[PDB]
Amino acid sequence: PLDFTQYAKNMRKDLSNQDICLEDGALNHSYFLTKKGQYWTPLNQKALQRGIELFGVGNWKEINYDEFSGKANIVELELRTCMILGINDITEYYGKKISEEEQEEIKKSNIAKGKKENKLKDNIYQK
Amino acid sequence: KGLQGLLQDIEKRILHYKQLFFKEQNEIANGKRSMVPDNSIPICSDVTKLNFQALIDAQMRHAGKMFDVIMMAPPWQLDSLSDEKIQNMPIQSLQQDGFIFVWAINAKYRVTIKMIENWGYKLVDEITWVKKTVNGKIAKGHGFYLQHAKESCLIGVKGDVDNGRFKKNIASDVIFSERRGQSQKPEEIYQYINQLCPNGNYLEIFARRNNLHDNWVSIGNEL
Amino acid sequence: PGEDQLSLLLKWRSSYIPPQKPTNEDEYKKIICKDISSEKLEQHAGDVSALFINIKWKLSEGQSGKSIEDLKKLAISDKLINNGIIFIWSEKEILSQIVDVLEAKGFNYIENFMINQLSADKALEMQRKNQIWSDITPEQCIEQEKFPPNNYVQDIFVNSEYSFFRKSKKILLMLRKFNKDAQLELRHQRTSDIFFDIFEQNKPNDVSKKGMEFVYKMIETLLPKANYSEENKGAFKMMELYADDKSQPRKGWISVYEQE
Amino acid sequence: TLEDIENEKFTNLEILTHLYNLKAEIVRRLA
Ligand SMILES: C[S@@+](CC[C@H](N)C(=O)[O-])C[C@H]1O[C@@H](n2cnc3c(N)ncnc32)[C@H](O)[C@@H]1O
């Protein structure tokens, strides 16, 4: 007989796009949990991180014009960037240029504060 | 004043909905599964730009076989592609033994029959979907001569389908079910196809995210 | 108390009692022959508008019926039909052949009228399995209107034996001839193209009397000018090809009988 | 027009975008 799981994995690897599989044949369910045209690829996340590294925080228009393309929701960029620092108020970082390591340590400090004050939600503190 | 209170309420509403957005995007990056089955093979490409030779090579490489059932729900011109362009699709190279399922509107019944017979198939069966209301009544529609409350699927066949694969005297011609969603066909056609050819290699053309099924190769530009 | 799916899909049965056959011999035109394929109908009719071919196909080596060669041999004249609609019974295995041999004569497919077959045997067996209702036959159920309750009719379809998907519908093909000189007076959207009717699991090709009355009323209210009137006396605009003494002697209908 | 925005046919991102556009419009009309 034919093993349909490995057959499906091979056919998805050969034919399906990069956003549909996970470079081993496994189905990318995050692609189908959202609507078509709004997925926020890991390439988009890395581009947003590069934009925060290069330009300041809050200047979403420059990131939209250069670091992504010409199609990027400013609201979604603000929301994803706020999830990057781990607090649902991206206000104290307005203007600063933050790289990857300091982004990770800021997220760690925010998650530690949330766990230490017992006022924490999913990757946002309370603000 | 009133606009200030509206601004305060809109701030409360964005604060409420940011929580929902972050909950969803934190559960997504935690191992949450959608309704799409794991063994689905979706391809997002225009059929007028898709290289079917790559699909033929991949199917022959990973199965040693061809497709058993090809189901089509064409966008008839009333995305309303064409008629001749739907005819020009290389279905003949896509199959050697099995069936084809083409959904036809009343204005494209004859065109569908002509396309099926021009692709090398022979018309042997016909499946009708009768629309229904929530009270178990026929959902009346509109037309020129009679009120249309039906939709037709035309079934061809190639080769020798009696070796060991396809079952006989199965399912029914009539599908009596509600007209849920947009111009979207019921899942009873998928159940009937799986009854006809259990554990087969199917292909679906002009598919959407509600058409994604196990063991089904689905093609659609919105997929 | 009568709000089941089966009772809800069968209200036309109470609303469509058929009439008696006409008594005066000027409302119909009954002719008997031996071979309708070879007979010229032009000498026995005129510019009719409804040609209902009640043909029973064979599709077997052991049961009676007609083949596609009989339809090919049948001659429909260019002045027998100028502005008319052919109503012909269809089957799944010869639908392409029927369409080809009729578009050769000039008639193009326009519409579909399906009778979704429902079993008076399967409904009785479902009622007996779920459960006064013992000494009763499906034919008696047909001709007494005493039907069992059913809120899921999808299990009582007449699923007749077929090599492919099981046959559970009866298709009436509609084909219209188009002429640019005259025009045909229709009546748009007065009948649904899908019609539930009870049957038996011994003869799925036999439509009931009330179902035949429904089909005849669909034809008559689709073409009102072809109905019986003072102007249509001796110049009937409705013709029947394969008639039987069940519901065919009618008002304003020409009836053709084969070997009677 | 919160009733128009809050419908059970829109994603949370679309709802948030509409809410942010409404907030920006209110702020600009006030100023
Ligand atoms: C009539 S719908 C068929 C889908 C079906 N109604 C369903 O239940 O999803 C037509 C579908 O074909 C897609 N489509 C249109 N043009 C296409 C093309 N050139 N290649 C592939 N898919 C196409 C449309 O976007 C839409 O998804």
XYZ file of C-alpha atoms and ligand atoms in Angstrom:
668
model
C 0.000 0.000 0.000
C 0.865 3.714 0.093
C 1.678 5.650 3.263
C -0.366 8.820 2.836
C 1.448 10.871 5.499
C 4.889 10.619 3.885
C 3.356 10.910 0.406
C 1.585 14.114 1.459
C 4.785 15.437 3.049
C 6.802 14.801 -0.124
C 4.137 16.293 -2.405
C 3.836 19.382 -0.191
C 7.628 19.736 -0.156
C 7.848 19.537 -3.955
C 4.745 21.517 -4.952
C 3.398 23.680 -2.117
C 4.761 27.143 -1.383
C 7.140 28.040 1.440
C 4.329 29.507 3.558
C 2.266 26.290 3.418
C 4.924 23.849 4.636
C 7.619 23.930 7.312
C 10.645 22.935 5.131
C 10.144 19.269 6.053
C 6.681 18.570 4.608
C 4.727 19.307 7.788
C 1.678 21.519 7.387
C 2.018 25.156 8.466
C -1.210 25.616 10.419
C -0.471 29.261 11.252
C -0.969 29.973 7.540
C -4.503 28.546 7.646
C -5.422 29.980 11.054
C -5.432 33.493 9.536
C -7.016 35.075 6.482
C -5.380 35.127 3.063
C -2.950 38.011 2.606
C -2.219 38.500 6.332
C 0.164 35.829 7.642
C 3.206 37.651 9.142
C 5.921 35.374 7.798
C 9.140 34.802 9.785
C 10.807 36.791 7.002
C 8.456 39.654 7.907
C 9.374 39.265 11.587
C 13.101 39.333 10.793
C 12.580 42.381 8.560
C 10.747 44.150 11.395
C 13.600 43.294 13.770
C 16.084 44.707 11.244
C 13.950 47.845 10.992
C 13.968 48.296 14.766
C 17.743 47.759 14.737
C 18.344 50.277 11.937
C 15.724 53.000 12.438
C 13.969 54.209 15.563
C 10.971 52.731 17.328
C 7.657 54.290 16.317
C 8.696 55.493 12.845
C 6.594 52.820 11.174
C 6.340 54.752 7.891
C 10.049 54.336 7.075
C 9.878 50.614 7.891
C 6.781 50.269 5.686
C 8.459 52.153 2.834
C 11.804 50.326 2.930
C 12.162 47.311 5.222
C 9.021 45.451 4.075
C 7.750 46.652 0.649
C 4.866 49.077 0.232
C 2.167 46.889 1.790
C 2.309 46.727 5.595
C -0.329 47.649 8.168
C 1.034 50.297 10.535
C -1.325 48.973 13.219
C 0.010 45.439 12.756
C 3.619 46.670 12.803
C 2.939 48.474 16.089
C 1.235 45.393 17.564
C 4.013 42.983 16.539
C 6.709 45.376 17.774
C 4.862 45.714 21.086
C 4.837 41.915 21.314
C 8.600 41.972 20.657
C 9.363 44.026 23.778
C 6.728 42.086 25.717
C 4.543 44.946 26.988
C 1.264 46.216 25.542
C 2.310 49.874 25.668
C 5.148 50.792 23.295
C 5.652 54.288 24.697
C 8.854 54.358 26.778
C 10.886 53.143 23.777
C 9.650 55.873 21.382
C 12.738 57.012 19.471
C 15.296 54.488 20.718
C 17.129 52.159 18.331
C 17.029 48.646 19.800
C 19.017 45.662 18.523
C 18.285 41.948 18.923
C 20.188 41.242 22.155
C 18.780 44.245 24.008
C 15.339 43.369 22.606
C 15.658 39.897 24.134
C 16.856 41.250 27.483
C 14.031 43.827 27.550
C 11.518 41.045 26.855
C 13.107 38.939 29.612
C 12.947 41.842 32.082
C 9.302 42.514 31.190
C 8.342 38.850 31.588
C 10.219 38.703 34.921
C 8.380 41.804 36.152
C 5.069 40.285 35.069
C 5.814 37.032 36.884
C 7.053 38.903 39.976
C 4.018 41.201 40.330
C 1.385 38.530 39.432
C -0.183 40.920 36.897
C 0.952 39.235 33.688
C -0.821 38.245 30.470
C 0.416 36.406 27.369
C 3.732 38.154 26.574
C 2.419 41.564 27.724
C 2.710 42.896 31.237
C -0.334 45.111 31.903
C 0.283 48.437 30.218
C -17.873 66.372 25.300
C -19.572 63.582 23.367
C -16.532 63.209 21.121
C -14.288 63.075 24.205
C -16.429 60.288 25.657
C -16.330 58.533 22.285
C -12.523 58.776 22.289
C -12.383 57.343 25.819
C -14.662 54.478 24.761
C -12.549 53.829 21.657
C -9.433 53.715 23.860
C -11.167 51.183 26.110
C -12.165 49.192 23.019
C -8.652 49.088 21.551
C -7.380 48.059 25.000
C -9.965 45.258 25.048
C -9.223 44.042 21.510
C -5.428 44.167 21.850
C -5.901 41.490 24.518
C -7.811 39.299 22.050
C -5.183 39.845 19.346
C -2.310 38.968 21.684
C -4.185 35.921 23.000
C -4.711 34.689 19.436
C -1.115 35.313 18.332
C 0.222 33.695 21.512
C -1.949 30.600 21.097
C -0.958 30.428 17.413
C 2.737 30.263 18.350
C 2.103 27.455 20.832
C 1.004 24.487 18.702
C -2.570 25.334 17.729
C -4.064 23.437 14.797
C -6.556 24.842 12.301
C -9.446 22.926 10.727
C -7.296 21.957 7.716
C -6.393 18.237 7.838
C -2.716 17.345 8.004
C -2.605 15.144 4.884
C -3.931 17.905 2.605
C -1.719 18.995 -0.286
C -2.740 22.551 -1.255
C -1.188 24.390 -4.190
C -1.765 28.131 -4.623
C -1.358 28.886 -8.323
C -3.363 30.030 -11.321
C -4.346 27.096 -13.524
C -3.404 29.165 -16.588
C 0.106 29.648 -15.151
C 0.638 26.344 -13.310
C 3.085 23.902 -14.890
C 1.145 20.634 -14.859
C 4.262 18.719 -15.949
C 5.795 19.297 -12.509
C 2.626 17.922 -10.896
C 2.737 14.894 -13.220
C 6.393 14.242 -12.373
C 5.810 14.621 -8.625
C 2.737 12.363 -8.621
C 4.482 9.666 -10.664
C 7.561 9.907 -8.427
C 5.815 9.757 -5.038
C 2.949 7.383 -5.899
C 3.846 5.370 -9.015
C 0.338 6.098 -10.270
C -1.938 8.804 -11.634
C -4.952 10.593 -10.203
C -8.094 8.563 -9.578
C -10.656 11.398 -9.370
C -10.417 14.942 -10.752
C -13.082 17.262 -9.348
C -13.728 20.659 -10.925
C -15.972 23.560 -9.917
C -15.090 25.939 -12.736
C -15.559 29.714 -12.504
C -18.040 30.041 -15.365
C -18.289 33.345 -17.233
C -21.657 34.819 -16.258
C -13.627 34.720 -11.000
C -15.425 34.058 -14.318
C -12.358 32.986 -16.260
C -13.493 31.710 -19.696
C -14.868 28.653 -21.485
C -12.114 27.889 -24.006
C -9.440 28.429 -21.345
C -11.212 25.911 -19.107
C -11.262 23.543 -22.090
C -7.527 24.045 -22.713
C -6.464 22.587 -19.344
C -4.377 19.387 -19.822
C -6.775 16.958 -18.152
C -5.846 14.244 -20.678
C -2.277 14.108 -19.347
C -3.558 14.357 -15.753
C -5.346 10.992 -15.724
C -5.408 7.591 -17.400
C -8.048 5.612 -15.463
C -10.819 6.965 -13.266
C -13.512 9.620 -13.094
C -14.003 13.369 -13.441
C -16.506 15.553 -11.554
C -17.427 18.894 -13.156
C -20.015 21.164 -11.548
C -22.171 22.839 -14.198
C -24.689 25.670 -13.979
C -27.836 25.504 -16.112
C -26.273 27.901 -18.636
C -23.150 25.713 -19.006
C -24.684 22.225 -19.024
C -24.059 21.656 -22.743
C -20.600 23.248 -22.600
C -19.635 20.981 -19.698
C -20.864 17.900 -21.583
C -18.912 18.934 -24.689
C -15.738 19.565 -22.662
C -16.043 16.203 -20.888
C -16.448 14.366 -24.190
C -13.606 16.385 -25.760
C -11.206 15.447 -22.942
C -11.596 11.748 -23.794
C -14.171 10.847 -21.142
C -17.585 9.257 -21.630
C -20.616 10.617 -19.783
C -21.960 7.890 -17.493
C -23.455 9.582 -14.408
C -24.848 12.825 -13.035
C -25.046 14.139 -9.458
C -27.523 16.866 -8.489
C -27.497 19.033 -5.372
C -30.959 20.196 -4.290
C -30.797 23.250 -2.044
C -32.630 23.157 1.279
C -33.940 25.531 3.934
C -33.674 25.194 7.712
C -37.169 23.646 7.875
C -36.418 20.850 5.394
C -38.007 22.578 2.406
C -36.703 23.268 -1.085
C -35.118 26.722 -1.265
C -36.879 28.305 -4.234
C -34.763 30.433 -6.548
C -35.206 32.103 -9.929
C -34.699 31.470 -13.615
C -36.071 32.036 -17.083
C -38.347 29.040 -17.638
C -38.480 27.517 -14.140
C -37.357 28.526 -10.657
C -33.868 27.052 -10.284
C -33.253 25.205 -7.010
C -30.652 22.724 -8.239
C -27.037 22.344 -9.260
C -25.540 19.606 -11.408
C -22.336 17.564 -11.363
C -21.428 15.735 -14.578
C -19.316 12.577 -14.333
C -17.098 11.079 -17.029
C -14.871 8.005 -17.056
C -11.701 6.726 -18.747
C -9.940 3.381 -19.088
C -10.840 0.200 -17.208
C -12.215 1.156 -13.794
C -13.120 -2.426 -12.795
C -9.674 -3.865 -11.989
C -9.729 -3.738 -8.190
C -10.100 -0.098 -7.228
C -13.515 1.511 -7.709
C -16.653 0.316 -5.943
C -20.032 -0.141 -7.617
C -23.635 0.574 -6.571
C -22.635 3.237 -4.046
C -24.018 6.528 -2.693
C -26.768 8.375 -4.586
C -27.294 10.878 -7.386
C -29.203 13.312 -5.145
C -27.620 15.524 -2.480
C -30.279 17.237 -0.338
C -28.547 19.807 1.866
C -28.542 23.479 2.803
C -26.966 26.208 0.663
C -24.556 27.353 3.357
C -21.955 30.049 2.746
C -21.155 31.443 -0.697
C -21.397 29.393 -3.923
C -19.916 26.439 -2.058
C -20.733 22.778 -2.602
C -21.518 20.393 0.284
C -19.128 17.845 1.760
C -21.490 15.037 0.751
C -19.782 15.037 -2.652
C -16.486 14.315 -0.869
C -18.116 11.541 1.160
C -19.560 10.054 -2.045
C -16.183 10.282 -3.808
C -14.478 8.529 -0.891
C -17.187 5.858 -1.080
C -16.520 5.446 -4.812
C -12.706 5.275 -4.552
C -11.563 4.478 -0.995
C -7.948 5.486 -0.253
C -7.176 7.106 -3.597
C -5.167 9.965 -5.069
C -7.598 12.780 -5.870
C -7.123 16.185 -7.476
C -9.281 19.277 -6.958
C -9.149 22.257 -9.320
C -10.491 25.738 -8.465
C -10.413 25.067 -4.735
C -10.796 27.225 -1.632
C -9.807 26.784 2.013
C -13.056 24.908 2.720
C -12.100 22.333 0.053
C -8.954 21.143 1.852
C -9.336 17.442 2.639
C -7.269 14.381 3.478
C -5.447 12.740 0.536
C -6.725 15.547 -1.731
C -4.467 17.672 -3.916
C -6.222 21.041 -4.110
C -5.388 23.840 -6.560
C -6.668 27.402 -6.247
C -5.358 30.962 -6.443
C -7.082 31.940 -3.174
C -5.786 28.844 -1.361
C -49.140 16.351 13.566
C -48.232 16.827 9.906
C -45.131 19.061 9.985
C -42.682 16.326 8.971
C -40.282 16.724 6.058
C -42.164 14.086 4.050
C -45.493 15.840 4.620
C -43.910 19.225 3.877
C -42.506 18.092 0.517
C -45.841 16.498 -0.514
C -48.376 19.359 -0.397
C -48.647 19.466 -4.188
C -50.235 16.007 -3.886
C -53.210 17.496 -2.059
C -53.198 20.541 -4.346
C -53.057 18.782 -7.765
C -56.052 16.468 -8.245
C -56.175 15.518 -11.965
C -59.338 16.098 -14.036
C -61.519 13.629 -15.925
C -61.011 12.831 -19.590
C -62.954 15.061 -22.017
C -66.260 13.781 -23.377
C -66.892 15.997 -26.411
C -64.797 14.955 -29.412
C -63.529 18.418 -30.335
C -61.133 19.148 -27.441
C -58.532 16.504 -28.367
C -57.121 14.712 -31.416
C -56.412 11.012 -30.831
C -54.590 9.111 -33.594
C -53.337 5.510 -33.535
C -50.504 4.156 -35.681
C -47.994 1.297 -35.775
C -44.593 3.017 -36.123
C -44.184 6.614 -34.963
C -40.608 6.653 -36.281
C -41.674 6.101 -39.897
C -45.016 7.935 -39.746
C -45.155 11.525 -40.959
C -46.665 13.673 -38.210
C -46.954 16.781 -40.412
C -50.058 15.349 -42.098
C -51.677 14.885 -38.659
C -50.696 18.108 -36.860
C -49.697 21.717 -37.435
C -47.596 24.449 -35.816
C -47.670 22.876 -32.369
C -45.823 24.419 -29.428
C -45.492 21.579 -26.880
C -44.176 18.204 -28.072
C -44.018 15.842 -25.085
C -42.252 12.623 -26.110
C -43.220 10.077 -23.435
C -40.552 7.641 -24.612
C -39.496 4.700 -22.429
C -35.849 3.828 -23.032
C -34.583 0.244 -22.985
C -30.899 0.256 -21.868
C -31.003 -3.530 -21.415
C -31.066 -6.840 -23.266
C -33.971 -8.262 -21.259
C -36.531 -5.496 -20.710
C -38.793 -3.581 -23.070
C -38.311 -0.042 -24.310
C -36.983 2.009 -27.200
C -33.432 2.699 -28.356
C -31.703 5.800 -29.692
C -32.169 4.443 -33.229
C -35.922 4.959 -32.816
C -35.303 8.620 -31.967
C -32.948 8.993 -34.936
C -35.525 7.406 -37.253
C -38.316 9.645 -35.921
C -38.941 12.549 -38.309
C -39.790 15.930 -36.775
C -40.672 18.245 -39.647
C -39.518 21.843 -39.970
C -43.157 22.961 -40.236
C -44.376 20.578 -37.536
C -42.329 22.645 -35.054
C -41.322 26.261 -35.670
C -41.661 27.808 -32.185
C -41.870 24.821 -29.869
C -40.413 23.046 -26.862
C -39.671 19.318 -26.796
C -40.174 17.538 -23.475
C -38.389 14.174 -23.585
C -37.548 11.758 -20.781
C -33.811 11.341 -20.266
C -31.481 8.752 -18.786
C -27.921 9.060 -17.535
C -26.266 6.625 -19.952
C -27.795 8.073 -23.144
C -28.045 11.751 -22.214
C -25.231 12.686 -24.608
C -26.812 10.612 -27.389
C -30.254 12.187 -26.847
C -28.717 15.667 -26.842
C -26.716 14.974 -30.015
C -29.581 13.448 -32.007
C -31.928 16.262 -30.961
C -29.484 19.104 -31.656
C -29.060 17.497 -35.072
C -32.764 18.242 -35.647
C -32.393 21.833 -34.403
C -33.536 21.667 -30.755
C -31.216 23.179 -28.138
C -31.115 22.350 -24.430
C -32.831 25.022 -22.320
C -33.881 23.623 -18.938
C -34.167 20.615 -16.642
C -37.196 19.283 -14.764
C -36.228 16.636 -12.211
C -38.595 14.376 -10.288
C -36.691 13.357 -7.161
C -37.787 9.777 -6.533
C -39.020 8.862 -3.044
C -39.798 5.292 -2.023
C -43.141 4.148 -0.658
C -41.424 0.872 0.288
C -38.433 2.329 2.138
C -40.640 4.744 4.097
C -42.860 1.851 5.208
C -39.842 -0.239 6.203
C -38.392 2.743 8.106
C -41.682 3.217 9.967
C -41.843 -0.507 10.766
C -38.238 -0.510 12.013
C -38.820 2.582 14.166
C -42.068 1.198 15.605
C -52.112 0.143 12.829
C -49.563 0.126 9.986
C -49.183 -3.591 9.200
C -51.700 -4.526 6.476
C -50.804 -1.786 4.001
C -49.029 -1.819 0.620
C -46.966 0.932 -1.072
C -49.491 1.175 -3.922
C -52.241 1.661 -1.336
C -50.062 4.338 0.283
C -49.782 6.034 -3.115
C -53.530 5.908 -3.792
C -54.783 6.820 -0.318
C -52.263 9.602 0.585
C -51.603 7.932 3.978
C -47.849 8.529 4.208
C -45.599 7.758 7.188
C -43.753 10.537 9.029
C -40.171 11.212 7.981
C -37.928 14.088 9.060
C -34.957 12.767 7.029
C -36.009 11.887 3.482
C -32.421 11.230 2.343
C -32.763 7.630 3.580
C -35.968 6.880 1.635
C -34.741 7.718 -1.874
C -35.377 5.106 -4.557
C -31.720 4.141 -4.981
C -32.033 1.913 -8.033
C -29.206 -0.394 -9.057
C -26.557 1.247 -11.237
C -22.937 0.359 -11.962
C -21.917 3.890 -10.937
C -23.709 6.106 -8.355
C -27.185 4.765 -7.664
C -30.044 6.146 -9.759
C -32.508 8.098 -7.607
C -33.947 10.770 -9.914
C -36.082 11.129 -13.040
C -34.988 13.761 -15.558
C -37.300 15.475 -18.057
C -35.207 17.181 -20.727
C -36.512 20.440 -22.187
C -35.355 21.469 -25.664
C -36.593 24.539 -27.540
C -36.541 25.363 -31.249
C -35.745 29.015 -31.978
C -37.172 30.875 -34.978
C -36.633 34.572 -35.667
C -39.925 35.202 -37.495
C -42.488 34.329 -34.808
C -42.268 34.497 -31.015
C -43.269 32.164 -28.187
C -45.421 33.454 -25.318
C -44.027 31.987 -22.096
C -44.709 32.499 -18.372
C -41.495 32.921 -16.406
C -40.950 31.429 -12.926
C -44.272 29.808 -12.102
C -43.025 26.295 -11.257
C -39.934 24.974 -9.508
C -37.550 22.845 -11.560
C -37.255 20.312 -8.701
C -40.293 18.294 -7.689
C -40.562 15.614 -4.993
C -42.840 12.678 -5.791
C -43.399 9.238 -4.298
C -42.598 6.077 -6.256
C -42.327 2.319 -5.719
C -39.293 0.053 -5.440
C -40.492 -2.173 -8.273
C -40.970 0.340 -11.139
C -38.946 3.566 -10.730
C -39.733 4.717 -14.295
C -43.499 4.948 -13.630
C -44.512 8.463 -12.593
C -47.714 8.710 -10.565
C -50.975 10.168 -11.853
C -50.565 13.290 -9.719
C -46.943 13.647 -10.824
C -48.045 13.435 -14.453
C -50.722 16.034 -13.684
C -48.020 18.261 -12.177
C -45.897 17.887 -15.327
C -48.873 18.607 -17.607
C -49.821 21.688 -15.579
C -46.195 22.856 -15.734
C -46.330 22.565 -19.533
C -49.734 24.266 -19.717
C -48.900 27.206 -17.441
C -45.519 27.582 -19.150
C -47.271 28.024 -22.531
C -50.721 29.563 -21.953
C -51.557 30.350 -25.591
C -51.209 26.636 -26.393
C -54.000 25.872 -23.901
C -57.456 24.811 -25.043
C -59.598 27.720 -26.231
C -62.082 28.675 -28.934
C -59.298 29.764 -31.299
C -57.426 26.465 -30.778
C -60.248 24.189 -31.986
C -58.962 21.892 -34.717
C -55.538 23.584 -34.540
C -54.169 22.155 -31.290
C -50.719 23.395 -30.282
C -49.811 20.527 -27.923
C -48.802 17.071 -29.155
C -47.987 13.800 -27.393
C -45.834 11.252 -29.185
C -45.944 8.035 -27.108
C -49.373 8.188 -25.492
C -51.073 5.825 -23.064
C -54.609 5.657 -21.698
C -53.599 6.981 -18.263
C -53.642 10.790 -18.390
C -53.082 11.672 -22.053
C -56.628 12.284 -23.477
C -56.760 15.925 -22.482
C -58.047 19.347 -23.508
C -56.094 20.803 -26.405
C -53.726 17.835 -26.745
C -52.944 15.691 -29.783
C -52.377 12.072 -28.743
C -50.359 9.632 -30.868
C -50.623 5.934 -30.006
C -48.254 3.153 -31.085
C -49.900 -0.196 -31.938
C -53.141 0.163 -29.993
C -20.013 53.656 14.629
C -18.804 50.934 16.987
C -21.734 48.669 16.085
C -20.649 48.647 12.433
C -17.064 47.761 13.387
C -17.956 45.108 15.984
C -19.434 42.380 13.788
C -18.922 38.617 13.794
C -17.375 38.612 10.325
C -14.152 40.603 10.867
C -10.764 39.533 12.167
C -9.272 41.098 15.287
C -6.655 42.866 13.154
C -9.340 44.384 10.907
C -11.354 45.472 13.958
C -8.231 47.000 15.518
C -7.392 48.817 12.271
C -10.916 50.256 12.057
C -10.770 51.286 15.724
C -7.384 52.971 15.247
C -8.648 54.815 12.161
C -11.702 55.981 14.124
C -9.486 57.140 17.005
C -7.224 59.035 14.594
C -10.254 60.674 12.966
C -11.658 61.703 16.362
C -8.274 63.105 17.438
C -7.896 65.064 14.191
C -11.453 66.419 14.434
C -10.820 67.538 18.019
C -7.534 69.158 16.967
C -16.803 28.722 -8.503
S -15.506 28.924 -7.292
C -14.952 27.222 -7.049
C -14.821 26.943 -5.566
C -16.100 26.392 -4.927
N -17.264 27.280 -5.190
C -15.901 26.241 -3.415
O -16.771 25.608 -2.786
O -14.886 26.771 -2.920
C -14.125 29.478 -8.316
C -12.805 29.390 -7.575
O -11.737 29.292 -8.548
C -10.764 30.265 -8.257
N -10.074 30.611 -9.493
C -10.456 31.558 -10.409
N -9.642 31.654 -11.428
C -8.657 30.712 -11.171
C -7.504 30.329 -11.882
N -7.137 30.869 -13.040
N -6.734 29.354 -11.345
C -7.108 28.812 -10.179
N -8.167 29.092 -9.425
C -8.912 30.061 -9.980
C -11.568 31.407 -7.655
O -10.766 32.374 -7.010
C -12.456 30.600 -6.707
O -11.672 30.186 -5.596
